[model samples]
Target: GQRWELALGRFWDYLRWVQTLSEQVQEELLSSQVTQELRALMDETMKELKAYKSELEEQLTPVAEETRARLSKELQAAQARLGADMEDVCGRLVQYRGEVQAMLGQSTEELRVRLASHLRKLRQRLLRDADDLQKRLAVY
Candidate 1:
């Protein structure tokens, strides 16, 4: 995600560079006109670059809108999924804690084995669910 942000920033920097180039070319055309034909060509090229800059800016509007929509949807989904996973984890933790407390009052091999098995299953399932949720978050 950080890399993507940096890449978009670099693209904006590049657009600014193009704008600067257009300005410099325009200035050069004003003073260094050894030939009329060459001056005309330089001026025309500068005009084209300025026009292109405007068109490029216009094209960015829809792209920004789409990115905003997609990011908002993905962020909400990720938050909900992670919240649910945390709730599940807390529930298992609380149940295990109670079981441990109860075991202290009575000693039995069956109860010990059952509690351990249940904890192991919950841990494994939680790990799987967490991995799946992370993958879903990384999709976009």
Candidate 2:
């Protein structure tokens, strides 16, 4: 029974000690020095990031400008070539169109003349046949 009482007393002392330590830890966490140090670190990191960004911008500017100029020159050359090709194609199309139109006109005229000749022959044949039939009927 005495050993049990001693163990209970030690347990109570340990609980009290833990509570005191917890309060101290809370106080230390809320101290101003810790917040100041964190703020200083954040400011330093922001400054370094800004400096790095500026350095990269400075290094890339000339390369970007050169690339843009080269691309512009190439585009101009390509456009000129395309323009020449377009003109050549347009000229060929116009010549082909004229040839097609001439062919169509000649074919239509030939067809009209042949049809007129055929119609004249048919009419003469019909008239001659009618005259023969009338003569035969008079004889009868």
lDDT of 2 by residue, 2-60 (tens): 33223323433432332232445224323443234333433443344334434534444
Cα misplacement distance, residue 97 of candidate 2 (Å) = 91
| All models, RMSD in angstroms | 27.3, 51.9
User: Alpha carbon lDDT of residue 19, candidate 1?
Assistant: 27
Instruction: Give the TM-scores of the predictions, in the order they appear.
Output: 0.37, 0.25
Model 1 C-alpha RMSD to native: 27.3
lDDT tens digits, residue span 1-140, model 1: 34322432343343233223244533332343212333343334334433443453454435577785775466456445534543453354345445646777565446445645664564455456545644643443
TM accuracy, model 2: 0.25
The whole-model lDDT of each prediction reads 0.43, 0.38
Can you give the lDDT of residue 105 in candidate 2?
46
Output the TM-score of candidate 1: 0.37
